[PDB]
Amino acid sequence: SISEKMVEALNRQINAEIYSAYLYLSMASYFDSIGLKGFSNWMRVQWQEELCHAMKMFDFVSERGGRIFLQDIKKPDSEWESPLAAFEHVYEHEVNVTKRIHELVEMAMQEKDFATYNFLQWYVAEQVEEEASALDIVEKLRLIGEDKRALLFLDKELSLRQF
Amino acid sequence: SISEKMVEALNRQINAEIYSAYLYLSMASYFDSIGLKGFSNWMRVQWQEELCHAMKMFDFVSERGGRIFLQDIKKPDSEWESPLAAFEHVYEHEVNVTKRIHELVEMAMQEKDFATYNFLQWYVAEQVEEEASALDIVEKLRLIGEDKRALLFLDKELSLRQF
Amino acid sequence: SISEKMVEALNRQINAEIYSAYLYLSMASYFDSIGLKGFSNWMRVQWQEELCHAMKMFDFVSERGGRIFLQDIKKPDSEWESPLAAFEHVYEHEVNVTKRIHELVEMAMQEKDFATYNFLQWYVAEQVEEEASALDIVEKLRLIGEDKRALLFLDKELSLRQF
Amino acid sequence: SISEKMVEALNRQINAEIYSAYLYLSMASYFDSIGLKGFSNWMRVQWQEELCHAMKMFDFVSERGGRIFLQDIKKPDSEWESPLAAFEHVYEHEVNVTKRIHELVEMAMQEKDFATYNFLQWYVAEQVEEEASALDIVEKLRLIGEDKRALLFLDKELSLRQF
Amino acid sequence: SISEKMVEALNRQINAEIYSAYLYLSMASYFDSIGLKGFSNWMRVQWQEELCHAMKMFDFVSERGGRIFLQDIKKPDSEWESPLAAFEHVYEHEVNVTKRIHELVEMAMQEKDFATYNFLQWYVAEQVEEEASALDIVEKLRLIGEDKRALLFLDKELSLRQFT
Amino acid sequence: SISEKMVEALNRQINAEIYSAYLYLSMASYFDSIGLKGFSNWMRVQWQEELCHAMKMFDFVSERGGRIFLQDIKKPDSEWESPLAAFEHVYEHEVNVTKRIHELVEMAMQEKDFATYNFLQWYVAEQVEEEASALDIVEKLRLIGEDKRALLFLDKELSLRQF
Numbered sequence A, B, C, D, F: 001s002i003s004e005k006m007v008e009a010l011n012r013q014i015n016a017e018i019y020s021a022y023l024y025l026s027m028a029s030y031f032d033s034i035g036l037k038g039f040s041n042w043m044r045v046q047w048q049e050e051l052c053h054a055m056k057m058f059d060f061v062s063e064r065g066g067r068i069f070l071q072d073i074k075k076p077d078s079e080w081e082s083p084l085a086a087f088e089h090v091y092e093h094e095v096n097v098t099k100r101i102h103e104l105v106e107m108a109m110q111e112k113d114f115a116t117y118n119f120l121q122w123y124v125a126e127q128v129e130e131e132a133s134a135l136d137i138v139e140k141l142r143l144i145g146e147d148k149r150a151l152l153f154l155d156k157e158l159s160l161r162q163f
Numbered sequence E: 001s002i003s004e005k006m007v008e009a010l011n012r013q014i015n016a017e018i019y020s021a022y023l024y025l026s027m028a029s030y031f032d033s034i035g036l037k038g039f040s041n042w043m044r045v046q047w048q049e050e051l052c053h054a055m056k057m058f059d060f061v062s063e064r065g066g067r068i069f070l071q072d073i074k075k076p077d078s079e080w081e082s083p084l085a086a087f088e089h090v091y092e093h094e095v096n097v098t099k100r101i102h103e104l105v106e107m108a109m110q111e112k113d114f115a116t117y118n119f120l121q122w123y124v125a126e127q128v129e130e131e132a133s134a135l136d137i138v139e140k141l142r143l144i145g146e147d148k149r150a151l152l153f154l155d156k157e158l159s160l161r162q163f164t
């Protein structure tokens, strides 16, 4: 019953959400390279959490009787200017994923692929948090600015991120 | 004491109530194909419920004495143009069943078969809900229309109905 | 993945399974007429049980993307020579169903439709138990023969079946 | 509000229920003598039930204003050929008492004493079970016939009746 | 389905049942003003109960596909001579109300509206208990006479009624 | 003690509280006649509550010895434009009755009838919640407006109210 088109559309978003994780992981290697262990953890946990959103979506596609192919994965950025510049790339990148989702939500309703539509809600519900929690840090990394005292303070705060 | 005409007239309503149930069963399959689980549930429970009407009357005919001969069952309509359409066909059908019963009611008067009269008062009452519950669900769909979000909101509501 | 060949073959099983139920309901009447209240009970439980064997399949097919259409149900044989002749029709009918199932399972391997193979193993098991639950009682009714009392004893046993 | 024609016709039905009670009580005596405890149990129970049916009407008459007088009660039969014949008298009398009620149902329709008509539907819906239980047993005693071992099985199954 | 003539005829009985409530509420106020709390309570319970009968019927109309329209309610009697005259009024009011329903029970049969006939059979029973309750009290207020210590006994006996 | 003027002014509030209840009931009929079962609930609950605001005061006047004369009640509005207009009429109406309480409260200060001034403080706190709960709704139906989906979402929410 699921459409040929939809399975294709979804297959790009599985293979995109895997790219998200591979990116954040690179950011962990960057935050590992400038001594920030909490930021490393936050990303290390982000890398895991994104992986599971693709796997939730992988499973769904297999449940509805669609076949999942996996295409190659691009080289993520290995370098940034500073912590603030990394989180500006995060915020921007999740906002692009936010719209990439809203498109599937539209495709699902145009086809009346209801089962899919309800399933995607979880990602419409999720992204609000990923956007807002990115921005919360982006605003703060500006407000803190060049002071290292407060940067290491926020470093420890993000070390306690789990799941 | 129970007349031969009654036993014939009833065996037809037992038979009719089973089709009334089978008809609801197919709508379930319909609503599954167009992805509406709660609309299907409603049907599932309705199929079950009408099947108990048939048994109620099955046992009455046996207790009263009459012998129950079962006729073959016709193939129900399997497709409808929209959910709205579907339920309009349901209302009409139960209004039709309301007629057949009100008839049997007068046939119990005009034979002076009081036992049967009183038995059938349940179905006189019962049908007041079947009409009303099905019309409420029609009205709603007309009021909703092609806003498919408002369709799902009601799909969930009908997902709750329980036996 | 489910091939159309299976979705057809299964819909036939469903429709045959529902006829199974409708047949015992007819026997429950028969056993109602001649006044064997446990024998009728036994049937009313098998009507119900066989009924749910059909909804198990219904949910599977629907859960797997196939489209379920409900065909016409044939009138059942409604009179038998005796309790023994009744129960010999049950045995031979269930021997026809047992065999009808093993033809599906073979198909399910040919289609390498493993999902359906495993789903059908429950129907294999449950036919061993209906074949032998029938033969326990066919044999007993012969052994009992025309002894009125034994019959009434066996009746009282059969009235304790609940599901 | 109640009429004197209606009050009068009721007191005979009360009377008539109490005789039904005495009659049955007299059967319990008979079934005692020929050495059947289970038919004595069945009778002693029906004795208590018929007796309660009258009181239900007694309280209704006293609730309606009317004054209840009690008349002398006839000697009930004391002897019967067989347990078979001793149930065929019960069928015939509970057939006559149903009839007796249906009259009282008609009386109320003419006088537009909807209060009484509406009260009597208990008895219309009750008397079904009274004719059926009676017939169900009547039919079984023909099937058994001269098998005393089966008579004592049926005897036992009628020993479990309560309240 | 449901006739126009019924939908108008039932909206009367709603109002009529709502008036039966307002009456019985104003009979409490009276008993209140002469110090009887048991008699007051009985009416306070009844006030709800007939209001309960009203909302039962309001629902049946709305269910059957009819529009309900609520008229203005008449000012009820405020005073009586005694307890006995109060409860002779209650017995006489319910008997008129009971006939008012037999009218609907017949009018239903006429329009072959078996769904209504059925629904109304509950009131036909119910009103049997209204008339018997009131007449049970009326006969008790006669036999008592002016025995104001019998009066206060019977007062307490009616303060054990409860609505549920 | 209680004054003649204070007892006159409370019969007015007892009789105005009832008209409020009768008004809310007639709004439950309006919301029923356009299919909104959650809104009808909300009005029925209100109908009941306001009636208990009356009886609370009905029992205070009787407790202080003063009499209760019950006048006739005006026919309330039957029809409205929309759900928004139906709740704009409610909000204006409860703000009339509030000001009306605020005049009585004064009447209690003026005359040094503190046992009443006290009693009424309960209405002074209540009307805040009567006005606020109405105003929170009035604002929502403007924001919603013609989106039938969100009309039905708000409808469902109201269906849960209970006292």
Ligand SMILES: [Mg+2]
Pocket: A017, A020, A050, A053, A097, A130
């Ligand atoms: Mg993401």
